[PDB]
Each structure stands twice: as structure tokens, then as C-alpha cells.
């Protein structure tokens, strides 16, 4: 497989005007996170074909990250190295995703 999955790596615990402000901050926090992960994927593991940060239950609280590397080789090596790294105070749980 060329795709790897970083399990529950995207965390995010805690009117009208409040909703709009909340939407913006979440979006900016999402984009910051994305760039953060994407850049590292390309910098140390290889060329990324596709990448997405998911919202598992739909509550924006937790999500997986999927990275499709152009090369099956890069993917397999990323999984091994990533499983030996920390991310935001938690160990990473990497896995090849069929």
C-alpha cells in the first residue's frame, strides 16, 4: 500500500458571532495542523500524492490522518519511523492502510 494512517492524531477538545469566530479558529487550527504534518511527510519521508485530516465521529474532536505517498517504499518506511516518534505529547500510532 502507498497509504498510511496516523490514528487519532488530530485532537481538539474545547452566540451567532461566537459560531462564526469558532468556525474561523477551527479552520485556521486545522490548516496549521495540516501544513505541520504535510511538510514533515514530504521533508523526511517522501513525495505526498494525497493527504487528508479526518473527523472520525463528526464531532471535530478526534480524527485520523491519511497520507498517500507516491511511492509504496516511502509509505512502508514512514510507518516504521513514525511509530518510533512522539507528536504533541503522545506517541504516534502509524499503520499501512490497505
Amino acid at each position: 500500500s502507498q497509504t498510511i494512517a496516523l490514528l487519532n492524531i488530530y485532537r481538539n477538545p474545547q452566540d451567532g458571532l461566537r459560531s462564526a469566530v469558532s468556525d474561523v479558529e477551527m479552520q485556521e487550527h486545522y490548516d496549521e495542523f495540516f501544513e505541520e504534518v504535510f511538510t514533515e511527510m514530504e521533508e523526511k519521508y517522501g513525495e505526498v500524492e494525497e493527504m487528508n485530516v479526518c473527523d472520525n465521529l463528526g464531532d471535530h474532536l478526534v480524527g485520523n490522518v491519511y497520507v498517500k505517498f507516491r511511492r509504496e517504499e516511502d509509505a512502508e518506511k514512514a510507518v516504521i519511523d513514525l511509530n518510533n516518534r512522539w507528536f504533541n505529547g503522545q506517541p504516534i500510532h502509524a499503520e499501512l492502510s490497505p
Partner: peptide, 23 residues
């Protein structure tokens, strides 16, 4: 900001040794 930031107090063991204790 995120990369390689270990849980407080566990910088001296590896992520794999930390995960081994999770259940």
C-alpha cells in the same frame, strides 16, 4: 510545535516502550 514532543516526563523512554504499556 507538535513533532517529537513527548508526554511530560517520558523523554527518556521510546514511543514504542510507552505504547507497550497502553491498554
Amino acid at each position: 510545535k507538535y513533532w517529537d514532543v513527548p508526554p511530560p516526563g517520558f523523554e527518556h523512554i521510546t514511543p514504542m516502550q510507552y505504547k507497550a504499556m497502553q491498554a
